[PDB]
Design a protein around this nucleic acid. Structure first.
Lengths: 56, 209, 114, 121, 120
RNA sequence: CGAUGUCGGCUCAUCACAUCCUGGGGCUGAAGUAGGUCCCAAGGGUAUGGCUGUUCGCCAUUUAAAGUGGUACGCGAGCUGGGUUUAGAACGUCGUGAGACAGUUCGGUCCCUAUCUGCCGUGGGCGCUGGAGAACUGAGGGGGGCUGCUCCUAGUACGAGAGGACCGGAGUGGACGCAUCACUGGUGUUCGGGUUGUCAUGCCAAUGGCACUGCCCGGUAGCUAAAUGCGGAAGAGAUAAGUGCUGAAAGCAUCUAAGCACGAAACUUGCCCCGAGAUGAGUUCUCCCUGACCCUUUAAGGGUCCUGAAGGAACGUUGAAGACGACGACGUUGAUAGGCCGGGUGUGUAAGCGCAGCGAUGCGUUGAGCUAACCGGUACUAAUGAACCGUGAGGCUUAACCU
RNA sequence: AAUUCCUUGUCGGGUAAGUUCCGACCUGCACGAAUGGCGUAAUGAUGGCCAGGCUGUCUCCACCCGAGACUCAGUGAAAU
RNA sequence: ACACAGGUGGUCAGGUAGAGAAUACCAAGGCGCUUGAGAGAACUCGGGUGAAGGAACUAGGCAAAAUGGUGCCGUAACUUC
RNA sequence: AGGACCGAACCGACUAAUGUUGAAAAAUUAGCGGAUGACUUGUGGCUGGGGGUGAAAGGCCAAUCAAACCGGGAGAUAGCU
């Protein structure tokens, strides 16, 4: 269970080397309204690929 | 002889006149089109690259398109290589492939085995579970001892423990060839070949026979 | 797929009789003891399943002498030669395991287009 | 069939309930029930039978609830587990008359006498 | 293991899953557009669409079967009267899933599942 | 001794050879069969139960055999607690007694979320020298290496008989490992039906909730063994014990000294799998990128604009792939999931109506109606075109080839 | 024998096989009469044994359902 | 120590089935237990179902599995009746 | 009538499993034993540490017991760490 010696700040950073967040790196632009949206998601003003799909 | 690539299309029974109920695996061994032959000068090994099936050519990459364009532009689902001992083959494709498997009596079938997940010790190896009821605090299917105290002080490299099983190449040898049907490009082999239905298969003449 | 089971349709026997579960049928099975081949009759109450293609079967139970013998028969097997329906049984289930295990249990015969 | 298995006796000289103490043939053979020979104790016996309680001798399994599988895929299942009693040294049938069904799997060597005496094969 | 197996458990027992999809089908029939989580909408397709396929043919047996699989007579009336003729020409695909963003309390993939010929 | 858990069992092993079986030999007081003893040989294999806490031991029954030791008399951050090793009680004995016993008996709390090494699986980063997409060579590494029974040869050789062949063939099994789900089965809370108690949907009828899936009876896909397939080889090389040929030192002799030949389940290959991070970073095939400016501390290098290619990644539908990554299919030039259509299957003649009856119920419509993950089809729904990354011809030394 | 060291005493039983059990023998290391001796119907969450039934205890595990474990968002310790 | 699975004296006691204050379902009333979303590996926990054999398990039938109600018959050794 | 029987409330605690940095400084879940008595329970009171009380265990006397807890002698003493 326990450690026999204290792990180092180096080994802490090496373990958190693969713990990093991933950027979006692209945002699709809807044709009818210029707002950028997550690809295959609603534009947050109510548009999908080319049409108004929800009122809210 | 040179092997061929087919796609597994299922398991059935064949009923002889005596009634022996041979379990047949039908393989769709379609016509195999050569894409490359390797001479001894250019490469150390003498072999044929073969392709089978169809690929749409929307998904064909231009490196693969140029490789297909040499030796006749026909895209297949993949390229597989069979080493030849003696027999010389052209870069064009053969018209019918199962005609060479007509004469052979026993075959070896290679396939990706079905994926069994992170299998346990009891499934992955044939470990024997400890007793269910008399005591046994929380140790029913767990691996027991893995090593032998201070003097080794380590567990060996070949230790039988839990891991991924399946998704691996396995060859089954000496399978009887029940029937060769040229028109449907069908090869009926006795017994059970590896893989799921629709997976790729490597059929070779028997090294044992 | 369609490339399979066309072979099954090649091998399926076309002379198969139609019987509901419960019917007391007789199956004539070839037996090749030596060069000589002879038909053997097995008669009993059917506990069968619907036709799964080439892979079809019937279970038949007879009390030979004190022993309940159950034989599963492959339908489209060449050893199964002739099945005669004989008595017809009216019962309310496909699988008659509970009804056959009881001693002295006799199913009724009903002829009302069933 | 297995060890600690009670069986009925087909033949007359063998008497009533018998138990399989050992599955002969094989180093660690666990289950044997078609034409195999098993070492037998007599757990309960009628006095008309020649053998008596507590006596060890061989037998051959003739009926199994698990059942044989025929080559075409047919399964003949016999209700009840049955044995024909055999001498230890000779492996020959003690009983003069065999009772009940027998299978064609018992057609080899000394079991020819068993299928000859038994009515339904 | 899960090979060729349909059905999403969604961390609930079978009775809760059946009750939840009955209520969700009732809400989707009633409002014609609902916001759910995305796997919930995806299995909601599988419960809701055979109801309209049954509701294409109007008979007492089919209304009784729809009442068995909903237990809401208003929903049965809507399936056999208002919808049904509307989706009669449509050969399946009465449901359309539009993925929204993510829920606030839990980062859950959110979706709007709607009827295709929505009046709004 | 500011702590190194104690027998046995269970699970899981690994090594040695002072070898139990299987292989090769020598000697035999080895006629055959079967043995004894010794040498070489570690590749594989090497029981189930009764009694008792037992290692042991005694026994019953297997088998080719049920090896001997090491590994903290292997293995308690793996398990057990019968054993000992506590506190209760009793008996026998000793002591006046408290109490004691290398006596007995009944009862009597066994904790850990794994940092490091180590393994078992599976990824990310960079490297391999322009960037890609493939297919492989094989340096190394692992897996696998067991055997019985019957028959032929042949009742032959061997033998007075009784018995009965270490050659050479054929089948058939046991234990083991691998795959598979065609069959036989199991399961199948996601299909059908029966049914008890109650509540609800107004009520009859039909259904639904709850009572372990209420109890059951069956059961599709999938998974699986108890089902079926398959395999451990034959070879080839170098050998161990061993047997030899020719042959001197030693005119004879001698298997060795120069030579020459056989000789094992051991070794190396042959069978399967991994595998170029094989930094010794390999090979082959194909695709793709050939614009300027300024500064400039020159294997040299920076900054700017233009242009971003082959391809990848992201996103989405997903998979008989999966802990997560990873991998595979498809993305409107679309069958990739859901739905729809038809079938298949499974369950067993739905509701409703009519008829017989006093009613329960029966009979007809009716093999009806429902049906799952299955099969064949279908753009009805969701797979939007962007965008992102990736570049613009690739360093210095000895060659033909022509300038 | 809750007592016998030797001892798993000797016999007979029960099982294929019985250091347990049961019943006898007396050779009581080291029983013995209110520190009670011998029996005893009933009673016992008592000690030991033998059967019938029953079953995943077992051969030998297989599938299924839920709660975790895995991933994602929020808060966020421990021994050492 | 806690918005802790524990402890806390009395009182009332609806329907149906039931001997019943057992239990099943419901009244009236009160709640879903202050983290959720997925996926459906090993392994762990609580269950369900198992082919054939059935105590071979084990220190020991530990655990599980079974039997279970009401009515009528019927019931042994021993006995302090 | 019963220190009768079966069995809820009630009182206890026989086996197993989980827990063991727990939900809990002895609980939970399946089974268990008594439940008209030598029962159980509420509210007060009494017995005080070489003392009490004990159907007897070195049990209990505030999660403390071969002699409770609090302060004092007290910086006891410590050939030991």
């Amino acid at each position: 269970a326990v450690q026999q010696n204290k792990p180092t700040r180096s080994k802490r950073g090496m373990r958190r080397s693969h713990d990093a967040l991933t950027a979006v790196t692209s945002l699709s632009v809807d044709k009818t309204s210029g707002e950028k949206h997550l690809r295959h998601h609603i534009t947050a003003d109510g548009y999908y690929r080319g049409r108004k799909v929800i009122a809210k | 002889m040179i092997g061929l690539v087919g796609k597994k299309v299922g398991m059935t029974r064949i009923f002889t006149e005596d009634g022996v109920s041979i379990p047949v695996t039908v393989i769709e061994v379609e016509a195999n089109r050569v894409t490359q032959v390797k001479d001894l000068a250019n490469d150390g090994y003498r072999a044929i690259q073969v392709t089978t099936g169809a690929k749409k050519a929307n998904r064909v990459t231009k490196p693969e398109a140029g490789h297909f364009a040499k030796a006749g532009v026909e895209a297949g689902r993949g390229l597989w290589e069979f080493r030849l001992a003696e027999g010389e083959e052209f870069t064009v494709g053969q018209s019918i492939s199962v005609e060479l498997f007509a004469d052979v009596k026993k075959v070896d079938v290679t396939g990706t085995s079905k994926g069994k997940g992170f299998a346990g010790t009891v499934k992955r190896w044939n470990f024997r579970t400890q007793d269910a009821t008399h005591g046994n605090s929380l140790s029913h299917r767990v691996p027991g001892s893995i090593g032998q105290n201070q003097t080794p002080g380590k567990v060996f490299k070949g230790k039988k423990m839990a891991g991924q099983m399946g998704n691996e190449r396995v060859t089954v040898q000496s399978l009887d060839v029940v029937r060769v049907d040229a028109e449907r490009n069908l090869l009926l082999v006795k017994g059970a070949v590896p893989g799921a239905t629709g997976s790729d298969l490597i059929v070779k003449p028997a090294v044992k026979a | 797929s369609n490339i399979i089971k066309q072979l099954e349709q090649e091998q399926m026997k076309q002379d198969v009789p139609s019987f509901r579960p419960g019917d007391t049928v007789e199956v004539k099975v070839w037996v090749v003891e030596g060069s000589k081949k002879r038909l053997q009759a097995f008669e009993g109450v059917v506990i069968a399943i619907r036709n799964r293609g080439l892979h079809s079967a019937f279970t038949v139970r007879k009390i030979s002498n004190g022993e309940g013998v159950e034989r599963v028969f492959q339908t489209h097997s060449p050893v199964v030669d002739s099945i005669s329906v004989k008595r017809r049984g009216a019962v309310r289930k496909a699988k008659l395991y509970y009804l056959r295990e009881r001693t002295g249990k006799a199913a009724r015969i009903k002829e009302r287009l069933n | 069939i297995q060890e600690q298995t009670m069986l009925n006796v087909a033949d007359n000289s063998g008497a009533r309930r018998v138990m399989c103490i050992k599955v002969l043939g094989g180093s660690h053979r666990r289950y044997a029930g078609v034409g195999d020979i098993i070492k037998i104790t007599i757990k309960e016996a009628i006095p008309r039978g020649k053998v008596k309680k507590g006596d060890v001798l061989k037998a051959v399994v003739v009926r199994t609830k698990k059942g044989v599988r025929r080559p075409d895929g047919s399964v003949i299942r016999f209700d009840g587990n049955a044995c024909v009693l055999l001498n230890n040294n000779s492996e020959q049938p003690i009983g003069t008359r065999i009772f009940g069904p027998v299978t064609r799997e018992l057609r080899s060597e000394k079991f020819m006498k068993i299928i000859s005496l038994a009515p339904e094969v | 293991m899960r090979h060729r197996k349909s059905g999403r458990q969604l961390n609930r027992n079978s009775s809760h899953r059946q009750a939840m999809f009955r209520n969700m089908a009732g809400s989707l029939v009633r409002h014609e557009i609902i916001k759910t989580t995305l796997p919930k909408a995806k299995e909601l397709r599988r419960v809701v669409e055979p109801l309209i396929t049954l509701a294409k043919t109007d008979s007492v047996a089919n209304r009784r079967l729809a009442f068995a699989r909903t237990r809401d007579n208003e929903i049965v009336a809507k399936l056999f009267n208002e919808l049904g003729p509307r989706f009669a020409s449509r050969a399946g695909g009465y449901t359309r899933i539009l993925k929204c963003g993510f829920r606030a309390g839990d980062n859950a993939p959110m979706a709007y599942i709607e009827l295709v010929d929505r009046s709004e």
